[model samples]
Target chain A: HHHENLYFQGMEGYRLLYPMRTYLIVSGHGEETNVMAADWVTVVSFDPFIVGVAVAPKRTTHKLIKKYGEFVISVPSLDVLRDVWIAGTKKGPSKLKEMSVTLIPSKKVKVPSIEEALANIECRVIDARSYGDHTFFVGEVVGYTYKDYAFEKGKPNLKAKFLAHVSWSEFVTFSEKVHKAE
Target chain B: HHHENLYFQGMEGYRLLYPMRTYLIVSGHGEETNVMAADWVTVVSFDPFIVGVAVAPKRTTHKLIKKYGEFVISVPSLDVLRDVWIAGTKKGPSKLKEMSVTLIPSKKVKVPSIEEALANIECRVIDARSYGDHTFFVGEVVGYTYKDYAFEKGKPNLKAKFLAHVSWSEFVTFSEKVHKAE
Candidate 1:
């Protein structure tokens, strides 16, 4: 009746929180831009509009963010799941074009965002630190791009159907049921 | 085609990344335990099994975790959404039992986990840092509890139906349709 016995067995314990949204994080400047799929992103603050994403030290996106001090978070719809996979698996700055991923300049940050994404958040890096094998980068959101139907009433519209990573090469989207806590 | 004009208008810009999973974070030792709803939790590492969560300094859970140096993450199924709302709104330690939240001792940490939760993660604080309005506590997960059929092959099963907070009071759950990227 309990799965507690599975501890230290493998990565199964982490799956309990899975099916998390997988965002396409874009970093670097101009022609040096790079994009990668990240499921470790989270909003860290509200006053200054801050968000964070954990990146491995060896990732090119990590190096680019460190060099430019800025990045963009592009939230993809299910329409670009294959492109999301491509961006995550291949090296960047070039793979974007190869996948036919259209690019658009952010309003405040130098980093570019993907046009196919449901939303794009421009951010300026305010803090960076190493947490084990990955470095968590905290950024102050400056600007963003989105469509009206993507979000309504401070919530994600059911039509968006954003992508959430479930496991290795597996994904799921939000259900439109909209249940209440009562 | 860009909605950059919406910046500084309101919280709308922040809605782009909405509908994130919210977890009940428990901390403290012995009879001094407390729980609170947190939507800012995310995985920071895998090799050492680490997770990070942001808590405001003024939160009772923050003081408890700082004093005990350990905490428990209780992942609630959609069944406890109202309880999740109550935990986030209430203050002090006495509210836990009043709300009928069942507690159980953790294997590796002094903090207790929720018995009725979908999963209980026991962790030891590995790192703590402040970012803007909140303090981010990085915990190394030492033990956890869950039921079988909730997960399969390193992914959350369709029936899991995890809760994701959309706005101040709104929420959504996972859809059953699993998509794969080829």
Candidate 2:
């Protein structure tokens, strides 16, 4: 029997939001690592460079985090969106092997970064908080790597149709900056 | 007698990040209005188009929303960050008048928009749900107004800096697209 957990089903009022590009990096203690799709992520600061993500402890990545205390975050392109969803649902690095997703070695973290990702951030866990069912992990970015030209002038280029996430079976694109908030 | 509400205090985590932009807008029935500084705001989607914000119900805007069924969200420039904080904390349109944070008529919502804002999104209450102490108000964009020159070609111009947030008394800048996703 499947055990019921604290997973939040946002379906009742879940509206298809604007698409945002996101990445998943794998982490594990001695060597086991897995990366999956994580769109519910955002930058929390700059001074020390922090990124905040909410993940479930039941997932393999969560177990890896508990053992290794580190992970990698990579942003995938529209082409990788399907792979992202599949990785999110499946279990372990074995799933990536099953889907034929390429795995690349990261410099700082033990985890392997998804080769198809445009940019990756190597993070060291500094603080965390429990809210609802997900454990919110706030990581201090220790190293940064990017694909050919994923970033410019210190921000993500919005004009690019970088992947944006929706509830399930949906993806969107970043079109334009609405208006300068002057 | 004042009732101690943990919701208001707990909802302030978004602002705890410090040096972020915030706004206070109030919506009520027929001339009954309120305003508060909102720093925990971010653009969520561009397709069906939407923005996500976290607001504490202890403030006047929350009460107005609970009673009247709608509220207006205003964005202000750095020049008016102080006024935004005052409006959010001091609790009055009269105080706003003192600071010269000019109030302008909204094209869609009953609550007036700030004259200092560069862009305005008039939203209708699509749905709201309580999370912890704060209520996440997800609004559908009904009408919008913008000042020309917010963006040049496909890049954000420095004019966008005017509305950057100030959290913990620090300023956050904007509008530079760093890299294209893919």
Candidate 3:
């Protein structure tokens, strides 16, 4: 027992998943674009490379995703933590402008990539369904790009200072100190 | 342009999700138990507190999950990094024995929780379907428990050193230096 203080229940249990990697869910395009910061995303498949992001019906990005059937996952670094807060805290279809995020045409999908992001994942939503308060949008990764130095030897370049969300306005980053096991 | 090194396509794009929180997926009970270290797990809903974990057909945990229709999401600290490696690298029904991981009876599911884990999330599978090479098992959180010291003031105790998967045998942990945004 590593200091058993167990009592955490209800919504607090989800906190165990905290300090997870956060990303900007970019939807729509050009002047009609929207960006929402989220940590509830993960790769669900690999054969065709499918990614899933859970969004609530309340967010403008959710309506945009349903209408356009596409979204871009922009991986932000710690340098843009303030932008992440702005994109997450505020709502509407003009987050890109408020964050002063620059857009670059994606290889696929109408949703453009954030030029300053560590990486941009272009996806097409093939499936969208409600799972309680949030809707899980399953997107097929159609195209993706990373900053030339974001990855090396097929692994993430730890020095990139990738951002991790703790909760609310708080965030955390990683250390290059990697532990390798035998 | 903050260094356009775009060329990363295919599976390399999923690397954008690197340094994500990793968890040990526990399945089965008694001597028939199995454990798997996975980064492909996330909360898909809040109303029902559902969790989705992607597991390939090859892993023993997949079959165990199919047989038992339940599993535990064990949040491990860096202290159990070796066990994470052991559970992930090997395949069988008795990984807990090999890992020497003690088990405690679950509150809602037959599957037991890892005694040394930072938290234990017991889940009952409500949906399981194939998504490419992996099967996404959607589980509803029936019960959950976290180490007393794992959380503080409704936030994760940063000193816990929550494990995040980078790639392969390499892993990264979080820092306590939380950045708060305005």
Candidate 4:
């Protein structure tokens, strides 16, 4: 490791934390659906089960979410990195199916989930507040679906691989070398 | 994989996404500093260099951040998982010294950063808004420091390992089997 210090300003400092998990956020109105790749997502509460996702106001999916007040979070594996990239760069509401992505109906919310996703969490928007140019939407999960036996004891299995976004065009995944702290 | 869908409510559904990177949030006043393990952190903006971290109202560090209006985010590697466990479980504000953590002065903020961290991000709180039982603190990153050359071209090296918290006491990390998505 180099022992030298590098300084950055503006947006340079934000790139320090690279390779975060990217999830496909699916939102829609009646008969119209949109998919966008998002990396700013995290669980906010435990007891009530809240998940927060940040969406830029300019994105079409952002408008769909506000109009419908519901969305689905689909976790895609590395096998679909190309599709994830397309979803992030291309405008949605109409072109998702052209990218070879299959949409499946959800059990709880009207928004459909990506059929190839490792797991899908259906949620209803409880709150939406703007922070800068983006709005952070807090969704209360109502239902979820995953591959059978993929999660043992509520933890993702080792074989379950995920594509982590490093930057605009790069990605990474978990390695086989695994260790559990005692 | 089983093709069945199971339903869960409350906190059970929140655990669907496993293995998230854990960071040590440090906030202090004067000479008193507090370090708390936090996993609910993600980037909110790119142009303004903002990060949003969720802190429960009851956490000592949460109160300290409100009092000081600044904090440091220290990314701990897997090597310090045990120390992370201590910081998360034990009550802070006075118990940090007993855990053998090394604190160093920050350039942009008064809150000190952890010495053994993979990287240290100094931030000034721009907004603190309550969301249910937790307050989401949006901090404008002012400065940062990392191990020399550990990052190349704005990406963390393969040797730079981070502790991903799976559950209350279990953790996971990246293996040497690295991949740069094409």
True contacts kept of each: 0.69, 0.00, 0.78, 0.41
The residue-by-residue lDDT of candidate 3 on B1-182, one tens digit each, is 11123344423556778878889999988888888998899888766678889999988999999999999999998888999988888888755667968889998999999889989999999888787778989899999888888876667888988998787678878878989885
Better of 1 and 2 by DockQ: 1
**lDDT ranking from best candidate downward:** 3, 1, 4, 2
Candidate 3: which docking quality band? medium
Candidates, DockQ: 0.62, 0.05, 0.62, 0.44
Cα distance off (Å), candidate 4, residue A68? 1.3
Give the C-alpha miss distance for residue A19 in model 1, angstroms.
1.7
| Residue B17 miss distance in model 4 (angstroms) | 2.3
Interface CA RMSD of each prediction in angstroms:
1.7, 11.2, 1.8, 2.6
Q: Give Cα distance to truth, residue B87, candidate 1, Å.
A: 0.8
Candidate 2 vs candidate 3: the DockQ winner is: 3
**Candidate 1 Cα outliers beyond 4 Å, as residue runs:** A1-9, B1-9
Q: Write the per-residue lDDT of candidate 4 for residues A50-79, one digit (tens) a residue.
A: 788988888898889999999999888877
Candidate that would win on TM-score:
3
- Best-to-worst order by TM-score is 3, 1, 4, 2
Number of backbone collisions per candidate, in order? Answer: 0, 28, 2, 1
Q: In model 2 chain B, which range of ten residues has the least summed lDDT?
A: B10-19
